[PDB]
């Protein structure tokens, strides 16, 4: 039943270093990271099933700091979102943002240079022009292979607020950007001009009572896209009933623990389609959501991530740790479902079976094919973690599925961790 | 820049 | 205090 | 005196892009200076594949291809000039692409009937069946050029790849499909319209992605002018009807921007039995872009109705709806009226004109927004003459 999970690699280790994004592209053999300085790290699995490891492919500086002369404000070059392309040509192309500009990024490999000049040697050492008679054009020759990647486009000035999301659209043509309350749509291919397709902004900003937290494409249905809110409500989009999406086709909201803390719990901070696109799954601080689509009242399933933290929402909130934004994978059949906690722990929720294990992302178990051993949590028998040994500043916040394969990247705040299937 | 009118490419 | 949608009323 | 084209032929490597660029659209200099020979063993291959990639160059090295024919030696040689366009045609921005497509087929003039089938097909089955849909999107534009041209044999092995690009796995490529759909159809003979072109259109109409769909529109203009009007209800109508009713806006929008293309093709018995009542629904549409759009299209659909019918289809079909236009919400939708809807008096005439129409105007002219007053007041030329 269980996977078998077992250490590969870890890469890493500074606020600067810490990583804040990750994201496997379509074929699943490139992986890229994104970090609090605005640094994109690509990884490239050797392919020489296929349990290759992976080795730094490519490393570019996605976005510098800048100040908001406007408003003077500095502007964080966090990367907050990787999302790549589907593979148009033997380049790859990925769109990087952080919270006000995103960057369509070509990455390309190149192995040949020219050879060959007329008015002087490949030193740089000139000749006369009067002894030049025969005019010779430069010859290609092979060279080492490098990876290059360069900004192709930039996306800026659009959003107001904080940009949280970015998702193509299964058309090939267009993307959305969510900020706090407003979600704009992009031409791939045109940077001076986006379509505002849903404002939720009040007139009177003492009003405001909800923000966006994510929105996300329908994988295959190229109209449909949701996004959830502070206060826990996804609203499904349709892009055929009208230009304007302000009119949600369906919302999703479900109906003895109405604590003080409850308004704050209930943020959804990532909502996930499956591959299929028929189930839709949610995070918020305690609990995992999975939804039918066609059933608007309620979930169908739901996980507590770490039931033991419901008592603990006190001491949570006086160091901010209730406000973490944790996120949620599927992977490639939609059977298992994963998201991260403290601790360094993250959680897999088997859907088949029902089953729960939480495994630990630590150097401890720094062997490559060493099986992590399930963690159990207890408010002690042997082998158990007490709850108040946890360490809340280890969070995985980040993590990402293979597409196809049994392969997970876990991140931790400054290393990144890649696990396999015991073969 | 940012139009709630249908730009030409969506048209 | 870090809630997002009050840092949002604040600065507008 | 060779000294200059020297410093042309190593800008080429010069990291400066203005530089470079500035070599690449003097290349007819290079060319000329070096020879016809050497151009094609020398110069050709350097420019086959260019590790620079900018699009100004690169698109700048597209427009100079084309024009490359005399300086590689003429007709005899011209096929030499396709390896550096077909690299053109895989790169990932969409104006190379074009540029480069259309030096294909502008060069695909110049290929004998031997040469076609003997460099340039092959070329279009390599852009067709290639791994990178970019190729296959490029691959689209160039069945038309060299269809006409090409042995039977040859051009039905061309209709099977232009099927499979109908039914490719990627939007992109089925966008491309969809846009070239019609003129290929106009180079096929009418038998393999009728068979094969129509399946290829329903399908395409039909498909999942609204971006492709509302192509099929265009797809629909120009099929039916090649069908003979006894064919169309058979064959177009079906197709065209379930596009006005489309559940994508989108697609709807297409429709009523080109209502009076659509209008034409058909005819005016077709324009009557269905036309009428479709544009009624536009103009009725939920959204707002849709009635703009069938707004604007209010004076040049009536006045190409039959004289048969002209002025009593106007006022007991077309013109109630008028009405509501009149008071629509949306400022854009009213705008669009108040610059066409003047234009309806010389043909319903001054008495219809003053007992209908003139209602209508005055209700406008006292509209709060200024952009509906002023089309109103900007189009008084033709109400004139006729009150």
């Known amino acids: 039943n269980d996977i078998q999970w077992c250490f590969s690699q870890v890469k890493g280790a500074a606020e600067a270093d810490i990583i804040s994004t990750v994201e496997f592209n379509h074929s699943g053999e490139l992986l890229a990271t994104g970090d609090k300085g605005g640094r994109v790290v690509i990884f490239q699995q050797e392919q020489e099933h296929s349990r290759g490891e992976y080795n730094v492919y490519s490393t570019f500086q996605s976005h510098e700091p800048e100040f908001d002369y406007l408003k003077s404000l500095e502007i964080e070059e966090k990367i907050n979102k990787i999302r790549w392309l589907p593979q148009k040509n033997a380049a790859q192309f990925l769109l990087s943002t952080n919270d006000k500009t995103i960057k369509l990024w070509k990455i390309s490999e190149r192995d040949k240079r020219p050879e060959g000049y007329n008015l002087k040697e490949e030193d740089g050492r000139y000749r006369d022009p009067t002894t030049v008679t025969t005019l010779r054009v430069p010859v290609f020759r092979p060279m080492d292979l490098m990876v290059e990647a360069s900004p192709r486009r930039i996306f800026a000035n659009a959003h107001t607020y904080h940009i949280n999301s970015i998702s193509i659209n299964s058309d090939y043509e267009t993307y959305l950007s969510a900020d706090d309350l407003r979600i704009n749509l992009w031409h791939l291919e045109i940077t001076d001009r986006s379509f505002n397709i849903v404002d939720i902004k009040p007139a009177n900003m003492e009003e405001l009572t909800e923000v966006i937290t994510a929105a996300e494409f329908h994988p295959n249905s190229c109209n449909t896209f949701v996004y959830s809110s502070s206060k826990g409500t996804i609203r499904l989009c349709d892009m055929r009933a009208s230009a304007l999406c302000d009119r949600h086709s369906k919302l999703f909201e479900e109906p003895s623990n109405r604590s003080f803390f409850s308004e704050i719990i209930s943020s959804i901070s990532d909502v996930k389609f499956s591959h299929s696109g028929r189930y839709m799954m949610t995070r918020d601080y305690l609990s995992v959501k999975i939804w039918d689509l066609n059933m608007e009242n309620r979930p169908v399933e739901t996980y507590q991530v770490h039931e033991y933290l419901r008592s603990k929402l006190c001491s949570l909130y006086e160091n ?61 028998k042997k082998d158990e973690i007490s709850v108040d040994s946890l360490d809340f500043n280890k969070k995985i916040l980040h993590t990402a599925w293979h597409p196809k394969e049994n392969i997970i990247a876990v991140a931790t705040t400054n290393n990144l961790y890649i696990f396999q299937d015991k073969v | 820049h940012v139009t709630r009118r249908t730009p030409d490419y969506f048209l | 205090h870090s809630s997002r949608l009050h840092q949002i009323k604040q600065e507008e | 005196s060779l000294y200059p084209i020297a410093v042309l032929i190593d800008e080429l490597r010069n990291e400066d892009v203005q530089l470079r660029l500035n070599s690449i659209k003097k290349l007819s200099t290079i060319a000329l200076a070096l020879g016809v020979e050497r151009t094609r063993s020398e110069l050709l291959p350097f420019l086959t594949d260019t590790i620079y990639d900018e699009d100004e160059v690169l ?35 969409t104006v190379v692409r074009d540029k480069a497509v259309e030096s294909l087929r502008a060069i695909s003039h110049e290929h004998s009937p031997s040469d076609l089938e003997a460099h340039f097909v092959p070329l279009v089955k390599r852009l067709a069946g290639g791994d990178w849909f970019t190729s296959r999107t490029s691959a689209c534009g160039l069945f038309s050029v060299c269809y006409p041209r090409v042995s039977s044999a040859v051009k039905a092995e061309l209709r099977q790849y232009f099927r499979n690009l109908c039914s490719d796995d990627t939007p992109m490529v089925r966008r491309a499909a969809a846009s070239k759909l019609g003129e290929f159809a106009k180079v096929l003979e009418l038998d393999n319209v009728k068979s094969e072109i129509i399946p290829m259109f329903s399908n395409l109409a039909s498909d999942e992605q609204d971006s492709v769909r509302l192509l099929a529109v265009e797809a629909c203009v120009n099929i039916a002018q090649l069908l003979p009007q006894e064919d169309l209800e058979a064959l177009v109508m079906p197709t065209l009807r379930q596009a006005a009713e489309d559940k994508s806006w989108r697609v709807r929008y297409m429709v009523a921007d080109k209502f009076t293309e659509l209008q034409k093709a058909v005819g005016p018995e077709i324009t009557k039995t269905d036309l009428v009542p479709a544009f009624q629904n536009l103009m009725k549409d939920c959204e707002a872009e849709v009635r703009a759009a069938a707004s604007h299209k209010v004076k040049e659909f009536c006045e190409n109705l039959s004289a048969d019918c002209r002025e009593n289809v106007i006022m007991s079909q077309i013109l109630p709806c008028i009405k509501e236009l009149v008071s629509d919400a949306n400022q854009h939708v009213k ?11 010389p043909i319903l005439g001054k008495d219809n004109t003053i007992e209908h129409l003139l209602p209508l105007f005055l209700a406008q002219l006292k509209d709060e927004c200024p952009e509906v007053r002023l089309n109103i007041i900007s189009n008084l030329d033709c109400v004139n003459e006729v009150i």
């Open chain 4, 335 to 345: 705008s669009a009226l108040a610059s066409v809807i003047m234009g309806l008096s």
């Open chain 4, 59 to 93: 698109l700048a090295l597209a427009e100079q291809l084309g024009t490359f024919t005399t300086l590689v030696g003429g007709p005899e040689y011209v096929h030499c000039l396709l390896p550096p366009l077909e690299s053109l045609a895989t790169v990932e921005e």
């Open chain 1, 320 to 380: 901010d740790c209730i406000f973490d934004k944790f996120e949620c994978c599927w992977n490639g059949s939609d059977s298992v479902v994963m998201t991260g906690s403290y601790n360094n722990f993250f959680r897999m929720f088997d859907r088949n079976t029902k089953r729960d294990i939480t495994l630990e992302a630590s150097r401890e178990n720094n062997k490559p094919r060493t099986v992590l051993k399930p963690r159990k949590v207890c408010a002690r």
